[PDB]
Write a protein that binds this DNA or RNA. Structure first.
Lengths: 93, 104, 107, 81, 99, 100, 79, 107, 93, 104
DNA sequence: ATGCACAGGATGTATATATCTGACACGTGCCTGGAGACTAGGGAGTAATCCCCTTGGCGGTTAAAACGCGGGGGACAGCGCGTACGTGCGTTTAAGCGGTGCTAGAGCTGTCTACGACCAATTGAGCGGCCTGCAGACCGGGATTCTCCAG
DNA sequence: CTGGAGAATCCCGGTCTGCAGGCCGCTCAATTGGTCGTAGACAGCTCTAGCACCGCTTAAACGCACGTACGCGCTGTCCCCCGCGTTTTAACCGCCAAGGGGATTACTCCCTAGTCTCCAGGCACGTGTCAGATATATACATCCTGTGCAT
């Protein structure tokens, strides 16, 4: 059947940061595995946070707290700023 | 010189050591005065007869464990002075030279 | 009105709708808020951008126009915080960092 | 299939140690390395076969190995994920 | 009329640099495949194997062994030696938690 | 001629190793560790209150971690034909554990 | 303010004795303090994170337990 | 008819209904089978029985009638498989096993 | 309110294995933590197994496979034996 | 003794080295025969003029690398026989004696 | 005068008895969470099909493994030194405990509002299949670097 | 230092090819719009426990003297591992052929979620012993230095 992956979005981001750089299929598979692994980590931590506090909903606050718990130092602050910016832009428009 | 809590010196063979007094003896009343106070000989405190009738002192030696407290009569304990420390060094050098002769 | 994707609404390259579906299908919670997929997609996009930029630098340093697993490994292991994040991860066909102890150098 | 651990030869272990930064290797290292590799492979393959058997399959897939490696705290990128 | 041999330890550094730059597999493939099948023989009979599963097993095993040698080298240098010995491997695996 | 009694170097040490490997009480003083915890918990948030069990759990975990790190340090020191632990032993133990 | 000096030399010595260490260099104690401090930070930070997600101002035992569990150090006897 | 517990039917001491509720409400899957809580309760009871037997042995070797954390630590750390199961677990007020390296002994 | 635990069942098991040995409160708390930890590990592994095979139900086969994956050596064999015996007795009755 | 593929043992100063042959020369026809072959002198192959007119052979030495191939004539290339091995050991012994005289 | 082997005083550890307490075990009320009964529909079990990909075989080439050997340099053992540890005692310090007091904030309850599940129609983003030009791999031969040794 | 020599590596053209990236048809999952129920946001109350202060008491930390055993530098021997040439093996590639089993699709049926009613298992709280704590008063067992034997 049909299998889905993050390849097209990884390629979009790569052409954003390095417009004259390509990528091999093995490297794209590694990047897809990386995205899936990070998704699983953040989602599992957010689920644990929701369960600890007697909540049924996973909101953006749980995602932010999970990002602060799972990312080190400057990565966490930059990711939190990016997520807040994205949520603000989504709510305004 | 000889007071409760004051420093005193004490002989032992050819050497001498500094001690602290805790019980001063009065034989005619058969009582020692102590600091944590005229009190009689206790259920475990006792002095031999050749020193129980003289001015005795229950002392604890500085630099030695509290299990080696000694009831010394007026025969060995002297008044704490600098000349006594000079004699301390005299016997210290005596023992030093004695051991150096034992070896060399 | 014509359909407008949530990714374009939030200004992101990663699919907000697919992230929302995966959050709903993963038995993470009973319900999912509206801003959670947007936040998660933004975070994933930022991390992808970081690793891709470092890997592109490492590929241009080696004088090539494509990123291979070796360049990803170099980028990750040379960056301290990415090395901390992917500390228990093995990148296939990535090799190792060329480090030699000083006591083994010829003297 | 018997005595295939001796197919992991001394030159191969030497190359693996060179990539690790090792300059001089005692002669008693190769057997210890074979034993360590056997232990690691047994621990991974037990879980891989457990995953294969739970699915009522007869062939071990790459995903079974990936899940076995992940369960042991060794995540492997680039083999299907 | 001299054979022109290198001093003990310079070829070792040369191949350290050679193998810390490449990324290919260092073990032969057929012997490792036979070893994997022989080990799996004791868990289930008549097992089949995708080639990518054996590839993943080999990648993980070589990464593990290279990392263990990197720890063994530190353990040996700690004893003020240059040669790695089995006790170095044992100490490394014990401190990791595997023993 | 009087000599004072004193054990040789390495006897009281073994006596203490036997004493402290037999009991289970905590070894760090409580108020100093509580002050250390409260000071460290100030680069993160201001005017933080603490449950007593929180500090108790922190002390348990930190002492268990230190004891295990000391065991690894002792193994590292012995590996170098020594009986004295040095900071390089702790550094090597933490490097091999993955902390460095 | 120097609360890391409150972890005194005898206490580090007791920890080493429980760890089976016979002889201790003089430079160990300071080193030990450093290590301890790092560990505490890595825990306390995470604990406070939980304390801030629940909109609480008091750090509870369960926050410490969760931080320890997520750092790979499971603790029994506190809930 | 009169109410009969499921643990009694299965011959268990651990609550099958409570385990079933904890499985349903724990966000593990959409559906939970009928024989899953019974299996899980049996496994939990077996592990509890193993640990309690070893800890009671340890408490008797110390001539005590009550199990304290020290006995649990001794039981877990002296058993190889139980020590592997609780490898990354810290038992509070449990202490350590009495072990002195040979080279540190007086020779 | 009221907080549930496993104390009574652990006490019953203790009185079965050592019918004259008691237990303190701290040790009982440790046993409760142990039971919760094992429950969470097994349930999480079973959920992962169910998701891997595209199935919505956690059956006893998922529990058995999770027990074989998480317990070492003889513990896995004995636990599987107890689980199978309990399931057979529950279905037959 | 002397054939393509056959062994030979040739002098080099006060010692000898054993080699394996690959080319047989013919000065009357000025052609060498080799094995992977009557062929004219090579574009990179040549012989010194003192042995190009004699029975020369292109030898590769044992224990030496593949680059020390030498064109040696019948002046040094001797017949590999029992006496040849004996005199090989003989000059080896004399070399050992000379080294010991250099040392002791 | 030196390694062996006892005697014994010192000292800190384990045993024995005795008294007291507070922590565990047991008993009672209640209430809510589990058990019994029943329905519906969808997830899973089963049977047939296919075609992919896994296993198996065989021949040729040559890369890599195996093997033998001389020699350097690294492992290791012994020795001498001095100093940085351990031990123990007198002194200073602050921890530990019990007490009194205050209030910030954890925990719980009631209301109702906004947010998220759910469903039906629309459709375009994304997946699959196909193709092709170029980035990279592979040569090969000069150029340049690195190591070694002899002077 | 310091030229040469030999080997290893680098570099720069020239050729060839697999796959990276772009295009295309289609379909199924994302979007839009409207309903509706309930999760939690929010405001208010209670009363728990966390923070603060203070006074005694004594265990613990600290400073310091003294000495000895251990870390470390140095030296000498020898053995074992490395560099390297030669012979042997089997890994790798290529090519093909058979069929096992994993994936797919249809059909059905039973098993689990949902709902209601009911009642007893478990939990919260109140009491009362007795296991463990704590204290004091004795046997052991080691540690260690001074005895002798005599080589």
């Amino acid at each position: 059947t049909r299998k889905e992956s993050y390849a097209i979005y990884v390629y979009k981001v790569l052409k954003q940061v390095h417009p004259d750089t390509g990528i091999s299929s093995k490297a794209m598979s590694i990047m897809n595995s990386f995205v899936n692994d990070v998704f699983e980590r953040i989602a599992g931590e957010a689920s644990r946070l929701a369960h600890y506090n007697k909540r049924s909903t996973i909101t953006s606050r749980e995602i932010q707290t999970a990002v602060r718990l799972l990312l080190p130092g400057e990565l966490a602050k930059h990711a939190v700023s990016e997520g807040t910016k994205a949520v603000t832009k989504y709510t305004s428009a | 010189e000889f007071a409760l809590g004051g420093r005193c010196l004490a002989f032992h063979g050819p050497l001498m050591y500094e001690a602290k007094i805790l019980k001063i003896w009065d034989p005619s009343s058969k009582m020692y005065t102590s600091i944590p106070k005229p009190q009689k000989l206790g259920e475990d405190e006792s002095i031999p007869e050749e020193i129980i009738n003289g001015k005795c002192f229950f002392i604890h030696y500085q630099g030695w464990k509290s299990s080696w407290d000694e009831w010394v009569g007026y025969d060995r304990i002297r008044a704490y002075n600098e000349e006594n420390i000079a004699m301390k060094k005299r016997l210290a050098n005596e023992a030093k030279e004695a051991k150096k002769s034992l070896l060399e | 009105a014509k359909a407008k994707t949530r990714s374009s609404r939030a200004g992101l390259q990663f699919p907000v709708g697919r992230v929302h579906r995966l959050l709903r299908k993963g038995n993470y919670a009973e319900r999912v808020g509206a801003g959670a997929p947007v936040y998660l997609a933004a975070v994933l996009e930022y991390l992808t951008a970081e690793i891709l930029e470092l890997a592109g630098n490492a590929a241009r340093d080696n004088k090539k126009t494509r990123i291979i697993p070796r360049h990803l490994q170099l980028a990750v292991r040379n960056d301290e915080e990415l090395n901390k994040l992917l500390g228990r991860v093995t990148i296939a066909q990535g090799g190792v960092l060329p480090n030699i102890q000083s006591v083994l150098l010829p003297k | 299939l018997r005595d295939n651990i001796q197919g992991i030869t001394k030159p191969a272990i030497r190359r693996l140690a060179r990539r690790g930064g090792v300059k001089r290797i005692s002669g008693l290292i190769y057997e210890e390395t074979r034993g360590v590799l056997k232990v690691f492979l047994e621990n991974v393959i037990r879980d891989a076969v457990t995953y294969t058997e739970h699915a009522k399959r007869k062939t071990v897939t790459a995903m079974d190995v990936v899940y076995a490696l992940k369960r042991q705290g060794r995540t492997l990128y680039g083999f299907g994920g | 009329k001299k054979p022109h041999r290198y001093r003990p330890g310079t070829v070792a550094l040369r191949e350290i640099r050679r193998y810390q730059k490449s990324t290919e597999l260092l073990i032969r493939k057929l012997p490792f495949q036979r070893l994997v099948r022989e080990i799996a023989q004791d868990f289930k009979t008549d097992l089949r194997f995708q080639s990518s599963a054996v590839m993943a097993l080999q990648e993980a095993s070589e990464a593990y062994l290279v990392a263990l040698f990197e720890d063994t080298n530190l353990c040996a240098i700690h004893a003020k030696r240059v040669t790695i010995m089995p006790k170095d491997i044992q100490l490394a695996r014990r401190i990791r938690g595997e023993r």
